Amino acid sequence: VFLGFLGAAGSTMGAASMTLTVQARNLLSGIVQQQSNLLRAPEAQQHLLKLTVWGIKQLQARVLAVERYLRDQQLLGIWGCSGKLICCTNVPWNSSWSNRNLSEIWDNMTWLQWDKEISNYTQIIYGLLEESQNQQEKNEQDLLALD
């Protein structure tokens, strides 16, 4: 079931992982409400300057929405999994990062309070993702070619 944009914000990590295509298409293709910026046929002079001063403020939010989108899509290409909305990266979950056990996480926690606990360690979890992919692409695949 699709509840609309952000509808699974209060559900569990287990029950909100059904709805990942909603916050992806409304992260870019909610811009269909902004393509009206090709306005109606304007009249003569007298506020020809007001037409372009407010034209940039409409276009900074168009360009800024695009070039914050690509750098988070490219980062999945560094880790080895581009395109896929679910990928698996083969990096061992160090037990100093977090806690309990696998099963009280997906059943009675939400993603918001989960993001709080693991935000403190996110720059070191992103550190091992670009290292277990580089070891595979330049070492393993060119060795399994010739051998």
Partner: protein, 449 residues
């Protein structure tokens, strides 16, 4: 347990953010409609279908006293007026000497003055005598007798174009992609702390920009009871926002009839002035009903006493000084600028136990300076015919005196001049959030070498 990171994109989580929103006004054909300063070249036609996706289990913290939507609405309003008035004609020739006189022959309490001055014809070497009918607030004395306008020292009085129209039209504030707006639906929300019922909205409801003081016209109502709302209630310098659950109607008029002259200035640029009183001289006034006003104060007193004490005496006084913008009630209706005397509404005591309307006398001036910028002033061209207005009063802006004595008698006065109380009383239930799609979580997946 030996687990492996998996990576999820599209996960519904948020961080708080600050950004600039979309004007997003409503729109029609408007094929003959005059360019309107509030929208036109700023807005885009509105999504006709907002979807209010109700969230489950979410409890978010809002704060209306540190919001940025109020702080950028006050900046856009100055920038919407300052960009429309670039092409408009300056009234630099009218800083001359005026041979004026009274209009009536028997003074009872006069209002208008009848003047005379020179003005260029088509060919700009010939001068002719022209007259007009200026109000006495907009004319000061130099030294039969000789008068001049109120601001020939410092200001360039820019005549507002006649093809313009200033009027409340509902603006919908929208967020661009990657951003979202959250609306509270709790009916006891005093303005801070957790809101246990949150729903994401694409675009807010249409607020009607009306610039008034001491009273909030055409606002949004409450839900069950009267909602009293302030920041640090024991602090004197903080205003007290009041919001009604039922509207209190008002009826306003200018009962004298007027026409327009067409005194030209230059090639293609004319000037409008008051010409004749076709009828009889009458004071502009406004009516508030009395039995509805005395019951609407029966609720504001009732829930003031939960903040101060049951056995206290609550009194209303009227004012203590200032300019016309903060001692009186300002409008913008029908194209003119009314400043009504409200010392008849805010006058009663409360002691903890049909058709007669209250009349309010009202002044008119046509050289206004809004936001008091140095050396700038506007001018409203006269409207042909009598003016009629009907409005609701939904809310007040009181303030508390509070010196250090021991008495049990509080006194509350209406308050005026800061426009951020008009906007903060409407966008209180909102907050903008950011959407962060990437996330990490442990599982048993293993890339498969």
């Amino acid at each position: 347990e030996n687990l492996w990171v998996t990576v999820y994109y599209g996960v519904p989580v948020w961080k708080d953010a600050e950004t600039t929103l979309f004007c997003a006004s409503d729109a029609k054909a408007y094929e003959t409609e005059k360019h309107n300063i509030w929208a036109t070249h700023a807005c885009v036609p509105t999504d006709p279908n907002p979807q209010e996706i109700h969230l489950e289990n979410v409890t978010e913290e809002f704060n209306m006293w540190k919001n940025n939507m109020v702080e950028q609405m006050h900046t856009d309003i100055i920038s919407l007026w300052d960009q429309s008035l670039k092409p408009c004609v300056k009234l630099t020739p009218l800083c001359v000497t005026l041979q004026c006189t009274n209009v009536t022959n028997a003074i009872t309490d006069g209002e208008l003055k009848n003047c005379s001055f020179n003005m260029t014809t088509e060919l700009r070497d010939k001068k002719q005598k022209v007259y007009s009918l200026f109000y006495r607030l907009d004319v000061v004395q130099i030294n039969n007798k000789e008068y001049r306008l109120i601001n020939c020292n410092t200001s360039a009085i820019t005549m507002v174009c006649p093809k313009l129209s200033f009027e409340p039209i509902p603006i919908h504030y929208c967020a661009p992609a990657g951003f979202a707006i959250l609306k509270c639906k709790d009916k006891k929300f005093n303005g801070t702390g957790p809101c246990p019922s949150v729903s994401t909205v694409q675009c807010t409801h249409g607020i009607k920009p009306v610039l008034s003081t001491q009273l909030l016209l055409n606002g949004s109502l409450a839900e069950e009871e009267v909602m009293i709302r302030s920041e640090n209630i024991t602090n004197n310098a903080k205003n007290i926002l009041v919001q009604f659950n039922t509207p209190v109607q008002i009826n306003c008029t200018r009962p004298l009839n007027l026409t327009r002259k067409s005194i030209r200035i230059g090639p293609g640029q004319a000037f409008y002035a008051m010409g004749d009183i076709i009828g009889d001289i009458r004071q502009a006034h406004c009516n508030v009903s009395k039995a509805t006003w005395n019951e609407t104060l029966g609720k504001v007193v009732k829930q003031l006493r939960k903040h101060f004490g049951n056995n206290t005496i609550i009194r209303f006084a009227n004012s203590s000084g200032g300019d016309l913008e903060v001692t009186t009630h300002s409008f913008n209706c029908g194209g003119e600028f009314f400043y009504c005397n409200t010392s008849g509404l805010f006058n009663s005591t409360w002691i903890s136990n049909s058709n007669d309307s209250i009349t309010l006398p009202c002044r008119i001036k046509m050289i206004i300076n809004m936001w008091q910028r140095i050396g700038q002033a506007m001018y409203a061209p006269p409207i042909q015919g009598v003016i009629r207005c009907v409005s609701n009063i939904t809310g007040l802006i009181l303030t508390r005196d509070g010196g250090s004595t021991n008495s049990t008698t509080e006194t509350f006065r209406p308050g005026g001049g800061d426009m951020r109380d008009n906007w903060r009383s409407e966008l209180y239930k909102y907050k903008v959030v950011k959407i962060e799609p990437l996330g990490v979580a442990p599982t048993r997946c293993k890339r498969r070498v």
